[PDB]
Design a binder for this molecule. Structure first.
Ligand code: HEM
Length: 152
């Protein structure tokens, strides 16, 4: 569990992210696609994108980035009590999209890298550790749902 102090660090930097959801959302998906090309293959919707320039130019990609961050934002603001928000997400990603747990770890690294790049002053080592724990909590709860459904 994260302490109240750790949650405050997480939410403080997340408030900054909400000032430019589209920009943050776009950078995170591009980071993920570049570092782990296999993740792009899960998206029939973005499979055609080959270069980073093509990726930055896609409005549909930017739109999806907003969907991912707003859904994650809703979860983080729940400070651990995210049962109702997480269940639906685990179900679709396990049974419909077929997203292995490892890919969730990849996008977690992408989120941390982007937060560090856009907010050096508010994303120090202490905030970085708090965010990592929050994302680990996110992955832990999702993995439990996957196991229940038979997806590891
Ligand atoms: C921070 C973690 C993530 C969050 C919050 C998230 C959230 C969402 C949401 C809200 C949707 C739309 C509704 C739904 O189907 O549930 C969605 C769709 C989808 N997600 Fe994720 N996702 C995450 C990570 C990933 C990862 C790591 C992958 C793939 C490697 C992925 C692949 C997909 C795909 C393929 C769709 C369907 C896209 C379409 O055809 O419109 N997601 N995700």
């Amino acid at each position: 569990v994260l302490s109240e102090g750790e949650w405050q660090l997480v939410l403080h930097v997340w408030a900054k992210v909400e000032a430019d959801v589209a920009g943050h959302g776009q950078d995170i998906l591009i980071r993920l696609f570049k570092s782990h090309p296999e993740t792009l293959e899960k998206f029939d919707r973005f499979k055609h994108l080959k270069t980073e320039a093509e990726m930055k130019a896609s409005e549909d990609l930017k739109k999806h980035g907003v969907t991912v961050l707003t859904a994650l934002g809703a979860i983080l603001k729940k400070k651990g009590h995210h049962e109702a928000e997480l269940k639906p997400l685990a179900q679709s990603h396990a049974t419909k999209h077929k997203i292995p747990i490892k890919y969730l770890e990849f996008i977690s690294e992408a989120i941390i890298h982007v937060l560090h790049s856009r907010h050096p002053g508010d994303f120090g080592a202490d905030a970085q550790g708090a965010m990592n724990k929050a994302l680990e909590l996110f992955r832990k709860d999702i993995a439990a749902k996957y196991k229940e459904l038979g997806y590891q």
